[PDB]
Amino acid sequence: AIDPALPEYQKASGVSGNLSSVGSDTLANLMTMWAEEYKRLYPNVNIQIQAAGSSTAPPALTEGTANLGPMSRKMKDVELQAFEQKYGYKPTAVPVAVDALAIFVHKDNPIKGLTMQQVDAIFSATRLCGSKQDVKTWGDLGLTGDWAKKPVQLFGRNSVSGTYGYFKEEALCKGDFRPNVNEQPGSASVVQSVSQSLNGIGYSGIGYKTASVKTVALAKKEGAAFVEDNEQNALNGTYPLSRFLYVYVNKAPNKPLDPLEAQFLKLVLSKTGQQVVVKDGYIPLPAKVAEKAIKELG
Ligand SMILES: [Pt+2]
């Protein structure tokens, strides 16, 4: 299930204090489960997690109120720069898992695949990926019979979601979402809304999949292959919305991390940590990714 070359976690000494995480909802369950494990190994640690969205991580790290900043996108240059203005160096992005950001439909929706131009036409007001068609009904996407006149009901994330920002950039070619997207407070609500809407569609991290929804395979263009969300396609990038999930930390350039943060990350980047990734339905890190991160952190 996980790369057999991932390291095993070993307990270290000198670990105590209060870890606070602020950021991604994509990573909410991962952070909770990792935290639970970390607390069991080190009962002197107290953990607090807030998971309102990736855009909340940079100011918390910059202001020093968070020790860990989970994000499902990289920081923007302007976010990196705000941190740097204060500290004199950039915050460090630790990869912790892989996502195949999913387009979810109801399990009984007969649609098999969408092109990225269709995805844009569904979700955007702007159609910058090049469709000429304002998609309003499932018939506009090729469905037939009673599906042809069914409206497409849209569900998505809010302004501070990293998933929202990544989807905007990659799936909408930097355009804007349609105003009739029903914004939800987190990924579980997106998937729940699609589960309760035969005619619904939403986007969220693959880990929030449930048996009531299915993911749609995605083609880069008409006449190109529809690529499924699976570990191989996310790890070679062929799945068009593959992304790493990150935890940002404040690592000063030639100075070790406080054990409180260091050991948490070491746990995440181990077999124990990556087993949690698999259990939550995300894609675990190749061993070489974990090794690179460990080295970058000291
Ligand atoms: Pt869990």
Side-chain angles (χ1 to χ4, degrees), residues 126-190:
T126 46
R127 296 190 287 284
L128 293 176
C129 306
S131 180
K132 175 182 272 329
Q133 178 158 232
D134 188 5
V135 170
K136 294 296 209 175
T137 65
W138 287 95
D140 290 335
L141 296 171
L143 286 61
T144 60
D146 289 356
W147 284 88
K149 299 288 167 111
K150 289 180 193 285
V152 179
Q153 184 171 34
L154 306 172
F155 300 97
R157 296 291 304 284
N158 71 24
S159 55
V160 294
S161 163
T163 305
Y164 175 105
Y166 183 89
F167 197 88
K168 189 178 181 310
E169 174 157 23
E170 301 289 331
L172 312 191
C173 301
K174 297 176 185 189
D176 295 310
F177 286 98
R178 294 193 188 273
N180 63 300
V181 178
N182 297 289
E183 288 185 359
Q184 301 299 305
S187 308
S189 297
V190 174

Side-chain angles (χ1 to χ4, degrees), residues 179-199:
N180 63 300
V181 178
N182 297 289
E183 288 185 359
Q184 301 299 305
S187 308
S189 297
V190 174
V191 169
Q192 178 283 132
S193 290
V194 175
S195 295
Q196 293 326 108
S197 179
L198 181 59
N199 66 330

